[PDB]
Amino acid sequence: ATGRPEWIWLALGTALMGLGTLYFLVKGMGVSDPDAKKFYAITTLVPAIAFTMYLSMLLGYGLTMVPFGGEQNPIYWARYADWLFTTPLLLLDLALLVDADQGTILALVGADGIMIGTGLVGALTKVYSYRFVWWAISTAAMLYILYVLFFGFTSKAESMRPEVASTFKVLRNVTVVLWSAYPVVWLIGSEGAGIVPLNIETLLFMVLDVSAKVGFGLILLRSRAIFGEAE
Ligand SMILES: CCCCCCCC/C=C/CCCCCCCC(=O)OC[C@H](O)CO
Ligand SMILES: CCCCCCCC/C=C\CCCCCCCC(=O)OC[C@H](O)CO
Ligand SMILES: CCCCCCCC/C=C\CCCCCCCC(=O)OC[C@H](O)CO
Ligand SMILES: CCCCCCCC/C=C\CCCCCCCC(=O)OC[C@H](O)CO
Ligand SMILES: *C\C=C(C)/C=C/C=C(C)/C=C/C1=C(C)CCCC1(C)C
């Protein structure tokens, strides 16, 4: 599996997601607060899922060849199986933090599923020009998600416990910056215009994935906002 130059970044991402999973797992031992237990369960599952998908890419299972532009292009499809389950869980962490209504949550998860789903179709589309149609629809779904997090949650977090509002605003800022980089990497990477080579693209996604899953988890699980206000 070492014939692919990007293997070094897949192995490092695999290791980092594995160590993050174990850290959150041990850290969650003994926590009895029901509210904190919810956040630990959601947040520990995120790197655990990504660990299995990074391992599958390292071993070569999560890779396929897609013909477009007159060439057989290597497409790591396992990323979308990862994101299909981890991006909803990350949104749920934010929504539960601000106690969002059930209707708003369904809208976020539904739009998230469309965003990843259309991204997958664009990744496997064989007509080159059609790949960017799916990219545009996926990006429009992400912009809807970002809009809700700003003009829907922020207005309700400010009316909550101060520790909750401060942690949400930090995680919301982190989320907006990191998530917005994904469509850009896709567009200029091997899946899109092919300006950046695959080995560099893999490096970019690895830094983003670890930050958005482990880094995001470190900020949340160290806050007092996940525990109920008790004496
Ligand atoms: C916090 C501690 C960790 C901090 C570390 C964060 C590093 C992330 C930086 C990445 C971009 C890497 C850019 C490397 C560019 C090499 C490209 C190259 O030389 O070939 C390109 C090819 O010719 C086509 O133009
Ligand atoms: C080298 C290590 C590689 C990386 C590790 C391999 C990951 C795959 C294995 C196991 C799933 C274990 C459980 C995952 C679910 C975590 C949920 C949790 O622990 O939540 C605690 C909550 O407080 C309770 O009520
Ligand atoms: C709260 C919700 C929790 C959700 C927990 C779910 C986590 C499942 C994780 C991983 C395995 C992913 C395996 C995906 C199966 C792909 C197999 C396939 O279709 O391969 C086709 C063909 O054989 C080859 O290209
Ligand atoms: C809308 C309400 C919520 C506001 C939230 C603010 C965050 C906005 C950020 C990003 C969208 C992603 C933009 C990605 C489009 C990049 C395409 C591009 O410009 O590429 C040019 C050229 O092809 C290469 O040199
Ligand atoms: C696991 C970490 C996070 C933050 C994953 C986020 C992924 C996305 C925001 C992906 C977006 C895409 C779009 C909108 C357009 C191209 C296809 C993608 C699925 C990469």
Author numbering: 4 to 234
Task: Give sentences from the paper.
Structurally, bR shares the seven trans-membrane α-helical topologies typical for other rhodopsins, as well as G protein-coupled receptors. The primary reaction from the bR dark state to the K-intermediate is the isomerization of retinal from the all-trans conformation to a twisted 13-cis conformation that stores a significant part of the initial photoenergy. Here, we investigate the effects of increasing laser power density on the light-driven proton pump bacteriorhodopsin with a focus on the K-intermediate that accumulates just after the excited retinal chromophore returns to the electronic ground state.
Reference difference density maps were recorded at 0.04 GW/cm2 with a nanosecond laser, for which direct multiphoton effects on the excited state are highly improbable, although the 13-cis retinal ground state may be photoexcited and return to an all-trans configuration. From these data, we observe the characteristic negative to positive density pairs corresponding to the move of retinal C20, as anticipated for the K-intermediate. The overall structures are very similar in the temporal range from 6 ps to 16 ns where the K-intermediate of bR is dominant, as indicated by their low root mean square deviations (rmsd). On the purely structural level, our results show that even at the highest laser power densities, the overall conformation of the K-intermediate remained basically unchanged compared to structures obtained using nanosecond laser excitation and freeze-trapping experiments.
